[PDB]
């Protein structure tokens, strides 16, 4: 078991002896080891970068050199490892390349959901998007890099090969509301189409972290899908506050997070089901949630509820690794 910790991607290895996670000394590490670890995480042949950095994880024991426990690293640095170029965008209608991970998911020539690109082949969305009668992958088309719904027509999108819902998804409560779509062909990345980064353990997000949502969702409660892609600012809302008797009264589980503004009609309706809730940290854009439930957008004391992607990242890695 291997993972990347925190916003500086500190490579950590689990120690069965100590039953705890520990950073890798830069000592004798190289790109082949980094690629091996990336493969082990499910990123296949992707590899972005690896460099030594000062350990900002707090740890007190490290893995050196084949790896063994060491109280110190001779190079006094630990491995920072990025398996894919992600979390980059351009630099209230959205500009081309502003939200390049945003996709629109269609059935029967109709926008049904949103999603987020995480690899050339994999999209994060909501499990309730692909609830029957929409569980057949052949029903779906993904449109990437296109801002206007009217330019999302037959031939302009990408066929979907696989739909995988979280195995503990509960449609009754919308608990664990996350799913993966695998495309039949890999996307070509450019200025307009790029992935968002999956969140790492230890993001240490602030209680009311500033986030963004994007999508083609209706602005007006009684309305149709927006023709053009929109985006908006939202603040995270602490789950204990979201679970107030005047908000969602204990419907928010550990697999959910709340975002928006409690007070006033701020019209946070731009998001689509399954679409991204992202935040910028360490100059990287991270996928913190996927839009799940809460129809009363633009309403006081009814913020958006999102699948908590941080707790689903291990499942996502497992699925990506299992493919093939």
């Amino acid at each position: 078991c291997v993972r990347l910790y925190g916003p500086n991607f500190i490579l950590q290895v689990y120690s069965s002896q100590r039953k705890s996670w520990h950073p890798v000394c830069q000592d004798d590490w190289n790109e082949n080891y980094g690629r091996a670890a990336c493969r082990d995480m499910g990123y296949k042949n992707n590899f972005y970068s690896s460099q030594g950095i000062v350990d900002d994880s707090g740890s007190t024991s490290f893995m050196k050199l084949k790896l063994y426990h060491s109280d110190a690293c001779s190079s006094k640095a630990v491995v920072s490892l990025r398996c894919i170029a992600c979390g980059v965008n351009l630099n209230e209608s959205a500009l081309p390349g502003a939200w390049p991970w945003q996709v629109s998911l269609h059935v029967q020539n109709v926008h049904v959901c949103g999603g987020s690109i995480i690899t050339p082949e994999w999209i994060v969305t909501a499990a309730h998007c692909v609830e029957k009668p929409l569980n057949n992958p052949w029903h779906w088309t993904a449109f990437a890099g296109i801002l206007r719904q009217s330019f999302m027509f037959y031939g302009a999108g990408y066929q979907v090969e696989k739909v995988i819902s979280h195995p503990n998804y509960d449609s009754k409560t919308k608990n664990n509301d996350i799913a993966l779509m695998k495309l039949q062909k890999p996307l070509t990345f450019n200025d307009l189409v790029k992935p968002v980064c999956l969140p790492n353990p230890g993001m240490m997000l602030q209680p009311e972290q500033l986030c963004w949502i994007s999508g083609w969702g209706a602005t007006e409660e009684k309305g149709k899908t927006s023709e053009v892609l929109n985006a908006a600012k939202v603040l995270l809302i602490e789950t204990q506050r979201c679970n107030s008797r005047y908000v969602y009264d204990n419907l928010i589980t550990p697999a959910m997070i709340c975002a928006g503004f409690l007070q006033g009609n701020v019209d946070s309706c731009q998001g689509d089901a399954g679409g991204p809730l992202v935040t910028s940290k360490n100059n990287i854009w991270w996928l913190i949630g996927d839009t799940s439930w809460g129809s009363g957008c633009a309403k006081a004391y009814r913020p958006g509820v999102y699948g908590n992607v941080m707790v689903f990242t291990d499942w996502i890695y497992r699925q990506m690794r299992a493919d093939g």
Epitope: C113, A126, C129, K172, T173, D177, L251
Partner: nanobody, 129 residues
Framework: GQVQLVESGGGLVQPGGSLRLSCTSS????????IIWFRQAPGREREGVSS????????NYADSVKDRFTISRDNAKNVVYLQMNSLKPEDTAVYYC?????????????????????WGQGTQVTVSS
């Protein structure tokens, strides 16, 4: 709290008549839930007849009730309604509401979704002369 659905409005009516069933909730406001009205008569299988999303923007009807039944909701009043016109002896059954926390996808709620849902206690509807 966990939602508790309560149906009412049933009773005896003549063929051709109308009834308006309604469903409310305790424990948790009804506005959060997608709602399916389904029915069951003794000896027959359960039958979803109508469904509606939390926002009311997608409704769905069984062929057997289309044009005669109309589902609607009033979130401020915490209620979901089923208007049943031109009633028929074959519409006799206990009518139940089934609820799920409602999602945001732009699609109908399937009529067979009562298999994993909160359920009310049902309200008897009898159509006879």
């Amino acid at each position: 709290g966990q939602v508790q659905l309560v149906e009412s409005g049933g009773g005896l009516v003549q063929p051709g008549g109308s009834l308006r069933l309604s469903c409310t909730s305790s424990g948790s406001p009804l506005e959060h839930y997608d709602i399916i009205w389904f029915r069951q008569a003794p000896g027959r299988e359960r039958e979803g007849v109508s469904s509606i999303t939390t926002s009311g923007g997608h409704t769905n009807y069984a062929d057997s009730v289309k044009d005669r039944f109309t589902i609607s909701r009033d979130n401020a009043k915490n209620v979901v309604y089923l208007q049943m016109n031109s009633l028929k002896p074959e519409d006799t059954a206990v009518y139940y509401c089934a609820g799920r926390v409602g999602g945001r996808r732009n699609w109908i709620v399937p009529l067979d979704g009562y298999d994993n849902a909160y359920w009310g206690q049902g309200t008897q509807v009898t159509v006879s002369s």
